[PDB]
Design a protein around this ligand. Sequence first.
Ligand SMILES: [Zn+2]
Ligand SMILES: [Zn+2]
Lengths: 316, 316
Amino acid sequence: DPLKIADQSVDLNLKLMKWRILPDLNLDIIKNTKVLLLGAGTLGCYVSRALIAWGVRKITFVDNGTVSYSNPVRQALYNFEDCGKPKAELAAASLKRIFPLMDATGVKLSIPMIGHKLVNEEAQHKDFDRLRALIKEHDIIFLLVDSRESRWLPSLLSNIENKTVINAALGFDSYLVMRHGNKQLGCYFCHDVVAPTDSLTDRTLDQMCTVTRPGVAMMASSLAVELMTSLLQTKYSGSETTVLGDIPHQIRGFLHNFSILKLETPAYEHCPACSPKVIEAFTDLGWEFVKKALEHPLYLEEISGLSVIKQEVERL
Amino acid sequence: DPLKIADQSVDLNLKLMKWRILPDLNLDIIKNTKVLLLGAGTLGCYVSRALIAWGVRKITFVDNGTVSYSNPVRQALYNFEDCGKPKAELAAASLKRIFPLMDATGVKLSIPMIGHKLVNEEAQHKDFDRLRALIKEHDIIFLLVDSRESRWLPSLLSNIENKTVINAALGFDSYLVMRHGNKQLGCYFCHDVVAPTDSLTDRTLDQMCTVTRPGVAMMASSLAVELMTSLLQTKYSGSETTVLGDIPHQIRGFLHNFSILKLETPAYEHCPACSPKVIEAFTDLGWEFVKKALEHPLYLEEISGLSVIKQEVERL
Ligand SMILES: [Zn+2]
Ligand SMILES: [Zn+2]
């Protein structure tokens, strides 16, 4: 039976990795990891391919988009004949074409961007609940959206549900891969991940630059998955390493000079996404809080305590 | 017309990259570059996807293999339904499914490994001529084979035909990407690219390790293509940089500690692949030379002058 053989083949490939090279490697915890991918664009496509090669069985894509004419060359699950079709379900179907016994599903769902007025209070209210449900349902959340403002709601919700989160963000010629965390590490929002004073091309990071160098998404996707697999391994006593090596908080890569930097950031007290007051506010008010924060980001800064900080500065 | 639109879409995406961010970027020289991929495995699949995103129009795959049951999860042009089919032509057909007006073709052809007796003097003689023809026909040669011994013949031939060559080689958790060159840089064979004293996992480099960490091939493929695109750009006066940044000779990446190293090596006088005596020998004797070198690698060392070096050492 060909299908059974294709199954036995991939688990076997992975077990030979373990016994030939890394006997301490825990492969089951990788296979049984339920993965949610927020974004079925270039990152979602490459991340999913890396995950299935590592034997991940359950992957869920979330995307509200449609396959465009320019998409297939950059986004590695789509063909020319797919143009027009809904992305998420297509992505899932494409995975099952590679590996038929995958538990891959697509959900067509929008993620509200902070700083934008709501278009349909009710529709997006539903979508909000639905998003929270998917996040609670899964084990690892990959945030693979095109901009900072689509990152906020899923970050908050992932923190609320205590899920490990892995962000990837692209600029023209550099990328960021970071984990938020299950001395706390701190999320994408805790600190400026890029300074107003840095390079012009570095400021394209997470601004839906549609014109990144093709290689950026490939590098970022594979590091993100390699970071996940290492992270799932037990840590060594007195060491931030596992059988697979390091588990950095953040990885920044640059194509122009072929470099990679690792760095770490503590959780910030007035973070708009993970600060205790923002949690407290969400826990007390729910969607009513979220809705106000979404349409009025400055409200978020009153809650976080960031405004009171900015005001004690002004007062000097 | 959908197809014409899909065409206009990708050239347009690339032109917006140029004018939004890098006005000096030469896109035509990338598009018109005839690319030969030696290997339609994991590297060939990922390299081709990166190339077409950069607008490369003509790609030729060369592989003697067949799609196996374990292949599709790691090798990104194949589906489960393709299992059994010949790889190279399948790879070409898969590219055209992504982007129909691609000039993509597959050639089923074996590359003889140095150190191995010939199985069919005549058949492989043909294949040798055919390989030389393909190399002369193309502009950039990517060496994406599974081991050192399959690298030798194409290296030699690429040097003979004065083609830019880009090698990628994988180990369990590290990779090497290098260009041979059009003070000469020196090829893959000029120096030990890994020492007998180094790590056990580092010695898996280019030994057809079938159990590399999935991310290794993704990283290596994208760097190799990003190296090619930069390399095709005019260099700045008094600087080893272009509009796209650096053009290192060699890039070594390591997953266990998420690092990348750049390094450079001069051409070696007694290289088995690029030394003047080996060139002279090939130019004088042709296939008769190649055949003897293939079955008897030690003959190669007499020719290169490497043996006389080893003997003056012994004599001390
Ligand atoms: Zn935070
Ligand atoms: Zn050499």
